[PDB]
Design a protein around this ligand. Structure first.
Ligand code: HEM
Ligand code: CAM
Ligand code: K
Ligand code: K
Length: 405
């Protein structure tokens, strides 16, 4: 299902990669995307899939483009174009300098200070979920930990009821890995109709939750509007429910297959942060992009005003030009080069929360359940989109080899 090749695109640059269903998905999603970095593929290519768009395949190009917001605007950051145009989240649908005052407020609510605020709840919940699973000797990790652990901490941070998780998660999934059951526009308006009354309630009677803080915050000297508060809160939801949730499954799938990597962390837990970095590199999972604000020649390639370009955050750290043996997980890498949390002005505002959830998960899981594996004969299926994911991760273990703390 290819869109007609636009007249300005040389055919030697054509490579029909489908970011929502890559040909090589069975081998793993990161492997499926890494075909873009084989010798037969140029640095910057055009796919006719999903409406037609560019893809930069090298970390150097991806970083350069994310840095140069003048040519590569965030106004339409999603593929396909209908999704990008509908996408109005704050601050991600804005360029500098407009982005600035909204970013400060985002950081107030999901940045470092809030991690330090919630540290104990994060630790408490991980221990609680894991201890509860430990004597079963089995679990479906996606639904049993990967989802409830980060999502409940986010609902806690946002003061929203856990009753709304299955609903919210669904709409959020629709914006990252669409079912086809609803357009991006449908999903957004569903999420907005959920948020709107809550925000109004909380502008009238301010709480201490993230939503109250955003909705009563200040930008450009004035009160934030109800619409703006909604557009920021919408993004916070997506980040809360469809990032770390997916990442945790990739990591745990890997660890289920590598006993030596597990023991490495169990014996020297001070290496856990560096290991988190490496896993974030190897199992990077995000791919959005930008839109050309004008005709622009970029590394020898003529880009036209209005062209969309996908700038896969996932690819930079997999680029062999940035990391030798990129598909190998190596906790001792002197430098873990990646752009897993993005690059430029829109660098992830929630990355400290994310790292915290990852590091707590690694430590607390391996403490109690050091020895586990994927269920016998189970086939693990990855899914691809703006944020990549795992359909299910059946794990098994002998409870005799586990340990309560
Ligand atoms: C493994 C976990 C995560 C990954 C890989 C990730 C990745 C990213 C990336 C690549 C961007 C930049 C998008 C762009 O440049 O267009 C971004 C932005 C953002 N993310 Fe994260 N994210 C994660 C977790 C979270 C969490 C838990 C939150 C909490 C709500 C969050 C909140 C945000 C916000 C608010 C922005 C916008 C910052 C701005 O536009 O100035 N993220 N994220
Ligand atoms: C691309 C992202 C990972 C980043 C945070 C959530 C996400 C889906 C966005 O809309 C911005
Ligand atoms: K390439
Ligand atoms: K838009």
């Amino acid at each position: 299902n290819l869109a007609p090749l636009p007249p300005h695109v040389p055919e030697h640059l054509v490579f029909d990669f489908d970011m929502y269903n890559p040909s090589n998905l069975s081998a793993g999603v990161q492997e499926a995307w890494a075909v873009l970095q084989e010798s037969n593929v140029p640095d910057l290519v055009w796919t006719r899939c999903n409406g037609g768009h560019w893809i930069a395949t090298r970390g150097q190009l991806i970083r350069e483009a994310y840095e140069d917001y003048r040519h590569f605007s965030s106004e339409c950051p999603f593929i396909p174009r209908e999704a990008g145009e509908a996408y109005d989240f704050i601050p991600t649908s804005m360029d500098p300098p407009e982005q600035r005052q909204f970013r400060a407020l985002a950081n107030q609510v999901v940045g470092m200070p809030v991690v330090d605020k919630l540290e104990n709840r994060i630790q408490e919940l991980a221990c609680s979920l894991i201890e509860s699973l430990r004597p079963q000797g089995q679990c479906n990790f996606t639904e049993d930990y990967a989802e409830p652990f980060p999502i409940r901490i986010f609902m806690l941070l946002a003061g929203l009821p856990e009753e709304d998780i299955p609903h919210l998660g669904y709409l959020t999934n629709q914006m990252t890995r669409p079912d086809g059951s609803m357009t991006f526009a449908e999903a957004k308006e569903a999420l907005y109709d959920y948020l709107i009354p809550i925000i109004e309630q909380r502008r009238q009677k301010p709480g201490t939750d993230a939503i109250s803080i955003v909705a009563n915050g200040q930008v450009n000297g004035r009160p934030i509007t109800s619409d703006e508060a909604k557009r920021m809160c919408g993004l916070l939801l997506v980040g809360g429910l469809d990032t770390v949730v997916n990442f945790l499954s990739f990591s745990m799938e890997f660890l289920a297959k590598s006993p030596e990597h597990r023991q490495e962390l169990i014996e020297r837990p001070e290496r856990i942060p560096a290991a988190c970095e490496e896993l974030l590199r190897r199992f990077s999972l995000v791919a959005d992009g930008r839109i050309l604000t004008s005709d622009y020649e970029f590394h020898g390639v003529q880009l036209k005003k209005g062209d969309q370009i996908l700038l896969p955050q996932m690819l930079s750290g997999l680029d062999e030009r940035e990391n030798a043996a990129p598909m190998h997980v190596d906790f001792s890498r002197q430098k873990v080069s990646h752009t897993t949390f993005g690059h430029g002005s829109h660098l992830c505002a929630g990355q400290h929360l994310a790292r915290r959830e990852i590091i707590v998960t690694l430590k607390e899981w391996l403490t109690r359940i050091p020895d586990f594996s994927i269920a016998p004969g189970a086939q693990i299926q990855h899914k691809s989109g703006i944020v990549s994911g795992v359909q299910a991760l059946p794990l098994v273990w002998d409870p005799a080899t586990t340990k309560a703390v």
